[PDB]
């Protein structure tokens, strides 16, 4: 099992489905003997440049630990879902639990 940090962005006119999305992804990770170390929902933010003629995206952040296959399946889900417009997955050396700079000055 390895440690990952995930960020994803959602269409502003679909902000009502974010709780369901979070619940489903958390269940997928927990069913495979993994853990969740940080979860944060940043709300709607103004973009620095437009993406497909949009501004105002909805942001979610997670820090998790799990096997590789689960992460691959989650990536495929992001690819084929149309509410998600951009995402990023990165590897870390240790679990991170502290609070982010966006929940300290927003």
């Amino acid at each position: 099992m390895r440690h990952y940090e995930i960020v994803f962005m959602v269409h502003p006119d679909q902000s009502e489905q974010v709780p369901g999305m979070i619940e489903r992804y958390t269940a997928a990770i927990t069913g495979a003997e993994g853990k969740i170390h940080r979860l944060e929902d940043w709300g709607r933010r103004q973009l620095a440049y437009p993406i497909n003629k949009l501004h105002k995206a909805h942001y979610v952040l997670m820090n998790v630990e799990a096997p590789q296959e689960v992460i691959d399946e989650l990536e495929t889900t992001f690819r084929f879902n149309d509410a998600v417009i951009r995402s990023m997955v990165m590897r870390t050396k240790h679990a991170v639990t502290e609070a982010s700079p966006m929940v300290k000055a927003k």
Binding site: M9, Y49, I51, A57, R86, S100, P101
Partner: protein
């Protein structure tokens, strides 16, 4: 030369820290050289990596006319 990261003993530069990253780009959006700001080479490399990540995630611009 004075390097704030060496002064404060930092480990990583944290692409999520926009307020800090803003001091190290010009008004066109370009990365400032190290010989102007006084940073060390190690932290200069880390800083460039962080800025590129933020540009991809749309927390910072690429240019001043998008």
């Amino acid at each position: 030369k004075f390097c704030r990261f060496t002064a404060e003993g930092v480990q990583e530069i944290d692409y999520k820290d926009i307020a800090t990253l803003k001091n190290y780009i010009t008004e066109s959006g370009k990365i400032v050289p190290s010989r102007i700001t006084g940073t060390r080479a190690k932290y200069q490399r880390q800083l460039a990596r962080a800025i590129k990540r933020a540009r991809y995630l749309s927390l910072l611009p690429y240019t001043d006319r998008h």
